[PDB]
Amino acid sequence: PPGPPGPPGPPGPPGPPGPPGPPGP
Amino acid sequence: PGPPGPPGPPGPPGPPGPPGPPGP
Amino acid sequence: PPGPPGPPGPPGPPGPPGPPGPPGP
Numbered sequence: 909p910p911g912p913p914g915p916p917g918p919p920g921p922p923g924p925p926g927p928p929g930p931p932g933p
Numbered sequence: 934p935g936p937p938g939p940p941g942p943p944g945p946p947g948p949p950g951p952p953g954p955p956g957p
Numbered sequence: 958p959p960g961p962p963g964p965p966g967p968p969g970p971p972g973p974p975g976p977p978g979p980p981g982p
Contacts, residue, residue, distance in 0.1 A: 910934065910935050910936075911934045911935035912935045913935045913936050913937065913938050913939070914934075914935060914936070914937050914938035915938045916938045916939050916940070916941050916942075917937075917938060917939070917940050917941035918941045919941050919942050919943065919944045919945070920941060920942070920943050920944035921944045922944050922945045922946065922947050922948075923944065923945070923946050923947035924947045925947050925948050925949065925950045925951070926947065926948070926949050926950035927950045928950050928951050928952065928953050928954070929949075929950065929951070929952050929953035930953045931953045931954050931955065931956050931957075932953060932954070932955050932956035933956045
């Protein structure tokens, strides 16, 4: 008989940067 | 052997974006 | 035995907007 499913994989990579902030005053 | 495990969780958030442009 | 580790997860979400820009003219 087969063994159990293996462990979870690792977390994914970081997301991309956010968008530029708003213009200055 | 068993099948592969499930996928990992989503990664961490990305960094803040760059500063905005100058004001008027 | 248990199976191999799963695949990595997906990328995380985008970062927040950046800081405000500098004063203008």
